[PDB]
Amino acid sequence: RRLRTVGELIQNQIRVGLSRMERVVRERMTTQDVEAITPQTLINIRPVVAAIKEFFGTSQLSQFMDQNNPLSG
Amino acid sequence: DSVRAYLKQIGKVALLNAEEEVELAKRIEAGLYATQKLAELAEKGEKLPVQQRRDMQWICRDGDRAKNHLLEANLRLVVSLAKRYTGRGMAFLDLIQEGNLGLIRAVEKFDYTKGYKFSTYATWWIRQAITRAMADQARTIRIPVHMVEVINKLGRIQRELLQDLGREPTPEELAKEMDITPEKVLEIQQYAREPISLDQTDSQLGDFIEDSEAVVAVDAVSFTLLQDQLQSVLETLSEREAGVVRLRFGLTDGQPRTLDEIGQVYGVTRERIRQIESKTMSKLRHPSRSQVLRDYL
Amino acid sequence: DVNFFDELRIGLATADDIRNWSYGEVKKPETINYRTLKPEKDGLFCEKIFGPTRDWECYCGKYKRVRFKGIICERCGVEVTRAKVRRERMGHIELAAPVTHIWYFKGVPSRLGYLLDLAPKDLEKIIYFAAYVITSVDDEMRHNELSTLEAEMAVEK
Amino acid sequence: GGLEEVLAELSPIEDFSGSMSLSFSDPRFDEVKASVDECKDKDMTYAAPLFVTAIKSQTVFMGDFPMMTEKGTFIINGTERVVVSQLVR
Amino acid sequence: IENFDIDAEAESLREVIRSGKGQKKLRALKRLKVVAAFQQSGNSPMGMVLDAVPVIPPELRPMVQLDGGRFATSDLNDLYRRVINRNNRLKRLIDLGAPEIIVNNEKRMLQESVDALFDNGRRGRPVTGPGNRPLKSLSDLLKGKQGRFRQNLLGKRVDYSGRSVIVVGPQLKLHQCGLPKLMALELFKPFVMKRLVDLNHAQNIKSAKRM
Amino acid sequence: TPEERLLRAIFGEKAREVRDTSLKVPHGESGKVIGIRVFSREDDDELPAGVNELVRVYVAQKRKISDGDKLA
Amino acid sequence: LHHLVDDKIHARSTGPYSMITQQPLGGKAQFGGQRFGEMECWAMQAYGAAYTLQELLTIKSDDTVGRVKVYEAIVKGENIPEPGIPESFKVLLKELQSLCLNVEVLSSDGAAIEMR
Amino acid sequence: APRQVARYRTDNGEEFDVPFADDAEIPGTWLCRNGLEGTLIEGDVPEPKKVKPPRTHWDMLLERRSVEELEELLKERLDLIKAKR
DNA sequence: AGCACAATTTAACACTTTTGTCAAGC
DNA sequence: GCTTGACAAAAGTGTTAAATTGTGCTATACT
């Protein structure tokens, strides 16, 4: 029984957003010469913020809450 | 698989060193000038040694072999540049073919006297040919490349300020940083929107799209009742009076006519038609005549 | 629209039948202008070929009333008629190189494969440019020159 | 922490050619932008912006991080959502 | 196909000798169905290779503005766009005198775009749009495949219809049914409007509609 | 349309543009209006690009138990 | 229970129609049309009622000029006209032509007729 | 008014009839169903064309090498094939 | 990416023809 | 019953000035 809990299955989606973000920090740091590079300028956080934005919106696990009575919710 | 076949075939051509690149570059420029020389002399009425002219025509044949040989050697360079632009809305092969188009121009504009390696100058054209292609093709609704620049530029300014402020910048700040009007960036953000598929999902989306142009069934009956009703209200008018109101509103032929046009058929001044209209319009406004037309609205 | 027809028959559509149906060739992969949101000329949705967007009105607007019907516009090339024709009119695309209909190639059984006696794995390698196929051969020249060619071949060998 | 565990296992990301110190640690939170009533009324999402606090050492912002309410629900675009639990092997 | 003799290839297939007790004769017999089919009729087998591709009318592949300002369009527009894009680039390559590797590669890409246009995914991976969803080709449209298959078992929606929840009608006769007044009113709406105009309750039909 | 302009000119109404686009109540529902929330363009508020005004109307219904309702 | 009569009752005489397919469209704020499936078409055929089945599938659903002239005849009180060609079938022919299949509807004479 | 008929001829020999503009002018060239440009048979040419020359490979070479530098290269090649003989 | 440049579209403002209108006279 | 000349507004038409759009181009080596 794995029982992926909300926070734990949230973290798994952050892994993909961070890993695919680190793939860009490898490539785009090489073309530009050194001393013009910082973790800030090269890191584009779009894949990280897109993953969490793409999770609640598109995931089957993220569900529209059903509440016509306190028990249903 | 299709892309695997292209890579297997281009991998056969052996890569060239610096000395092979310059020699082929010479043969191409020699072939071009030889081809142009032979064509210009007939225009100027000149003749050459028979044997030597033959030799020039072989320079034309050999120039093209150097051109094709130079393209086939660097076909690996095009793919290496096209691997980074995958997944952005264009198929890999299309990026490769559009890259090959840039490669073709790199060979045409290359300069062997500058002594720079060919991969240095070729990367510029090959990389620009791919990007320029995406601005012209990727979007279903095409956007000029100049607008694709500012769209991509505004996205970079938006992404830089998002990191700078800690919040997504507002239209005013995004415009102040980009030196444009605040309502201008709103219009830009409308253009950057991309369409959605009507065929996506129980029932497809297109099944819910109303037809707004098709008129209701009741009105096609009421309009014909209004048409027949106005026909009777025209009977109480004079024969020319009916003709004037018809021609004026274009009830008969569908197009309104100017006073001048209307009078021309009846042979009276355009002012006289303006006078006849005022009387028919007031006579049409008489209660006995217009009593029925109130309900139709 | 008699609502009563005896037969309904089909057949392979030749390139001429396709050119006959079409009201014009769509030349551009364009859908609609991004500002005006109106159909781009010579592309998809082009009113000059498929049909006018609005009833009895052309593109430029020099013909609006129903008085002009069955005529075309000199400036924009739009026939003035009901907008329903957009649903009834087809275009076409002239191909720079011939192309196979996937239904007769990948079908089960393969219609071209059974027609020319080409195995489906061999036929896939031709139309997708994975192999060469001999279209024609000259028998007289091969038989007459076979002597000298065998000599030069054995000499090189 | 979960984010720390994810950030620590990836930290540092070492470029093959030359070493790069990208190690991330001690992520920072800010108080929630608006209340659940404001987020549901204004159609925005209930979130607390999170920026990572970590060879240059320039602290970087990441994005609006959604938060869970006392009822155990998320407001995503003004709608109250619940994340079900998944059972795999 | 240009230099090909259907009758001469049929006579060769007409032979049932050459023992052919196994699949050797049935291969010639099974394929003869496709060879004899062209001979009987006047159709040319050249129809299998298209020199021109027809374009479906736009209203059947519409692009219309959705609710809230969004845009919507059929997949055919992108699949047609895939074809005309490569067909045009092929013209540019031919006029450029490009090597045969590039030209023949573009011809293969042109071949695959028309394949995807007619029946997408039949060979190789299908063309995928946003979210990695296979585009709907003309074959999917004709078969009625929405997710997997809806083979016209949805029929079509009809006018002058309605539904509601049912309750017991123990006092009814077998030929009777209890009909809600509102449901029967909207259902017979064109009928009541007529009789209402036959009498003087409403002057004209437009007035009876509001009544 | 030509037939509509005549009545318009006769009684004085004009071809003021326009196409009527109003948010009416859906067929088969009724109630009272409890509250309205309006988002305008004059005030600086947050809204989608180009949309000037956004107004949401909330209608409440007191539903008596009726034959056909499902009980359990 | 949440299922209530006010929400589950639907009735439609005439209403909007879809754009691509000219059939009525249910699921909007007003006047949803009921679906007549093939299973219902099978029952309608079992009874042997040819006209009732034809009315549902042509002038009640897909006849562009049919459903308007019926509403007209019903208002005037005249006989209901004979149905036309359903738009679903006309769309079917174009889908075949776009597939490079040349289809032709031939009468007893006047070889080929075009819908238009 | 509304009747006026004109015919256009394409490069491949096909003929096309376009009725239009009973009261107005007629163009000299028309994009037809064939996808090719048409030409009116009656009512002459009366339209010019700009006809800008498509930029070719010779234009890109001539704008870097002078005609003297090309002539010297051509001599280097021609003398090289003479050495083969 | 970004800029330069040419080519094409757009909007301008303008001066002229067309069209609707008033007052006076036939 | 009708026309005249004034005057205006509106509709066109030719001549210009932005803007919009399309194409070309970028040289450490880079396969």
Ligand SMILES: CC(=O)O[C@H]1[C@H](C)[C@H](O)[C@H](C)[C@@H](O)[C@@H]([C@H](C)OC(=O)C(C)(C)CC(=O)O)CC/C=C(/C)C(=O)Nc2cc(O)c3c4c(c(C)c(O)c3c2O)O[C@](C)(O/C=C/[C@H](O[C@H]2C[C@@H]3OCO[C@@H]3[C@@H](C)O2)[C@H]1C)C4=O
């Ligand atoms: C709009 C929405 O969100 O619907 C949600 C969900 C139904 C809502 O929570 C809904 C309010 C529901 O809570 C109440 C509702 C009243 O119940 C009912 O509707 C009925 C009538 C059946 C109950 C009844 O009256 O009898 C009451 C539910 C009580 C029970 C025992 C129940 O139903 N259990 C139930 C039912 C399901 O079918 C699924 C389901 C699913 C997953 C991963 C689930 O765990 C499901 C589940 O547990 O995978 C599928 C293929 O598809 C997933 C589709 C949707 O998920 C989204 C999530 C994302 O949102 C936007 O993008 C995503 C979108 C694509 O998918 C589903 C998960 C799918 O069928």
Ligand SMILES: [Zn+2]
């Ligand atoms: Zn026009």
